[PDB]
């Protein structure tokens, strides 16, 4: 049809336009920068509590607590500083792929193959946590719920539709459809006005939360994308894929900058997370170990080999004081 | 050094850690049963034998509690979430016999079987095949050969040898006959005996797992 060839000519126009601005590689301009060196992180803690594979974790806003979800059916709110277990929430369905901890500390969201990421209310008068609300309406499988605030929650899905829910009325408001894949990760910008989503189309997209329309579309991966984190500045974001490479896209440059690839690496990527400054680009590889990355020099600076199964989730504190690379052997390890 | 009131917080951790273990033990008591099948192949017929997204079927039989996971409704990329089930005791299949002329969809089922038996995650989990709908299969075989979808077959049109042959044809896709064991029961409308096979098979695979953990086998 005419619309088809119009779509390819638009794609050619976009490619030529973004080729017209790529006049300097990031490594080319940062070649004269002193390297970070080597980053010897050691496992400061180990909470040998879980029994099944761990699929997600979200650090607290106050940089101390962290919620961790596992296939045993209980996501437990850790106290990273003192190894304690603040809470233990038995799920309705043991299948969980994501969990989020609200930036106010009084709400926990979690979901999986049950098409519902329930909202738990922690700081309640009734003494025990409970399902505050059961947000339902997706038709695939949720993969990353993230809290905008105590009322708005963005959710990924397996039915190509990221949704922005509204807790107090239950029913959602917008529906960020438009790419026909399987969204496996989300990432809120630091100003929380924009968020990016990674599906199995090998195409991460930058959505406007307020408007509801795809602001920008990024390509450059061949296989699926299942790990994305914003740069702390808020104008770049690194994507993790099964390609054994991590790519760093820019929002204002609208295109790829770096490809954190390694010939020795053949395993996929499960989760990616920058550092507080952004220099370090941590990433959870599928070969049972993490791997740091100098995000302006494209060469590694250490390996966090401390797990026996694949590391399936990461998180970096808002203070930048720690990471914790949760893996499938039921052990999170708070590196530093 | 010690803390002060935070030792009671540590006690709270212990007070739920113990409970965590007593739920973990209970989790080992339950038997997991991933349920696959073609589009309305036999899934409804096998779930109706005994009491949105995944619809878990909890039921018990002779002091053993089963969980069944009807994962057909997950209309998405299977390989993205199939690794969540690495640990399920048994992949209870269900493929209809009567679905052997429309779109040779058993070969599509073979592809599905090829995806799940040769899968990297399920390199140790048994596959309890269920070639149900015997009656309609007998009707459609009394008036049509198996060559309508699989020309290479050159046997007879009687039920028994052809059914055993296609059972062996399914079993030949294993390629790892030692670590696992692909069961199979040709059952439709067999009342409690179907469930009895399920209990027997899961007790067998649990005993095999225990023998492998202790090292006897």
């Amino acid at each position, epitope marked *: 049809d005419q619309l088809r060839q119009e779509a390819e000519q638009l794609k050619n126009q976009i490619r030529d336009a973004r080729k017209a601005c790529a006049d300097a590689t990031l490594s080319q301009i940062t070649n004269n920068i002193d390297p970070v060196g080597r980053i010897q992180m050691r496992t400061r803690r180990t909470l040998r509590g879980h029994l099944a594979k761990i699929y997600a974790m979200h650090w607290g806003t106050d940089s101390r607590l962290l919620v961790s979800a596992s296939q045993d059916g209980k996501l437990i709110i850790w106290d990273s500083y003192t190894t304690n277990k603040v809470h233990a929430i038995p799920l309705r369905s043991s299948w969980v792929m994501t969990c989020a901890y609200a930036p106010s500390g009084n709400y926990v969201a979690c979901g999986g193959l049950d098409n519902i990421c329930s909202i738990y209310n922690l*700081k309640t008068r*009734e003494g025990n946590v409970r399902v505050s609300r059961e947000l339902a309406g997706h038709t695939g499988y949720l993969s990353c719920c993230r809290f905008l605030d105590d009322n708005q929650i963005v959710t990924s899905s397996g039915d190509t539709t990221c949704a922005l829910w509204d807790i107090e009325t239950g029913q959602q408001t917008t529906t960020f459809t438009g790419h026909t894949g399987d969204v496996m990760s989300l990432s809120l910008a630091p100003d929380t006005r924009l968020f990016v989503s990674g599906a199995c189309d090998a195409s991460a997209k930058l959505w406007d939360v307020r408007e509801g329309m795809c602001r920008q579309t990024f390509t450059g991966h061949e296989s699926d994308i299942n790990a994305i984190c914003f740069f702390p500045n808020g104008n770049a974001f690194a994507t993790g894929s099964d390609d054994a490479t991590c790519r760093l896209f820019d929002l204002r440059a609208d295109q790829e900058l770096m490809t954190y690839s390694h010939d020795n690496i053949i395993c996929g990527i499960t989760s990616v997370s920058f550092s507080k400054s952004g220099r370090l680009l941590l990433a959870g590889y599928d070969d049972f170990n993490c791997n740091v990355w100098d995000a302006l020099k494209a060469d590694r600076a250490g390996v966090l080999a401390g797990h026996d199964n694949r590391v399936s989730c990461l998180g970096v504190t808002d203070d930048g004081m720690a990471v914790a690379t949760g893996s499938w052997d039921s052990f999170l390890k708070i590196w530093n | 050094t010690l803390s002060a*009131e*935070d030792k009671a917080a540590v*006690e*709270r951790s212990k007070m739920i850690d113990r409970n965590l273990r007593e739920d973990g033990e209970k989790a080992a008591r339950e038997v997991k049963l991933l349920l696959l099948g073609a589009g309305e192949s036999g899934k409804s017929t096998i779930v109706k034998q005994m009491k949105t997204g995944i619809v878990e079927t909890h039921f018990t039989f002779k002091d053993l509690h089963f969980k069944m996971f009807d994962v057909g409704g997950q209309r998405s990329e299977r390989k993205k979430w199939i690794h969540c089930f690495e640990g399920v005791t048994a992949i209870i299949f269900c493929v209809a016999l009567s679905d052997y002329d429309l779109v040779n969809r058993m070969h599509e089922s073979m592809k599905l079987f090829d995806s799940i038996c040769n899968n990297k995650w399920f390199t140790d989990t048994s596959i309890i095949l269920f070639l149900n709908k015997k009656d309609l299969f007998e009707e459609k075989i009394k008036k049509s050969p198996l060559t309508i979808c699989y020309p290479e077959y050159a046997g007879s049109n009687t039920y028994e040898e052809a059914a055993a042959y296609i059972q062996c044809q399914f079993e030949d896709l294993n390629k790892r006959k030692d670590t696992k064991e692909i069961y199979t029961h040709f059952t439709c409308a067999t009342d409690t005996k179907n469930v009895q096979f399920v209990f027997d098979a899961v007790t067998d695979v649990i005993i095999k797992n225990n023998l492998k953990d202790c090292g006897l086998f």
Partner: single-chain antibody
Amino acid sequence: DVQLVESGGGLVQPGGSRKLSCSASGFAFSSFGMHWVRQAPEKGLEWVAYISSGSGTIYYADTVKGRFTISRDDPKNTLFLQMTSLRSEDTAMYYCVRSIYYYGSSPFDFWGQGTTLTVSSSDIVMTQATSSVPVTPGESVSISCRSSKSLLHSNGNTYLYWFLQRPGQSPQLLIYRMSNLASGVPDRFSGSGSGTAFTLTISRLEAEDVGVYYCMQHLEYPLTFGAGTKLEL
């Protein structure tokens, strides 16, 4: 909502026995380290005995150790204190206090109505500043409370609390760990100070807030209250 009601009480014979019972409806009683507190009819509060969650730990005040005992009936949600050899100084009004201990938790959230018990005829001492402060609605109030030990633990949060016992009522928490606020009270209250020197600042006071404020610490058992400052008009 959360409800704590007691039983027993009245007048007894000195030296006898009395099982005081505290009911509990409306919360997860199984995971609440409960307390008991004495209130003599003419002076301030004093800690009786603490029971942990799941009965895994038991404490007592030094003056009552070896005379009482706490038993938890978790399936029926009832807390018993058995008193034996009651002397003339053991007459008071008794409150059963729920409390949950984790990171960011607020112990002493909700206090029972309390029951009276009338018999017939070292540790951190929390000193107050006065017994009455004449105030008017609208202005500010600055209660002060010194201590006798450095309440600033190594983890960096001083385990000092505050309360408010309005007349003919039961005291509820206002400030826990000297900076935080109890869920259900206005943000006009504000604690401050250093170790061994703590201050509460009631900003823009109005009526119905004229009860006694009991300075309390929680570093080490036996946790001890203060004499309280009964402000009036």
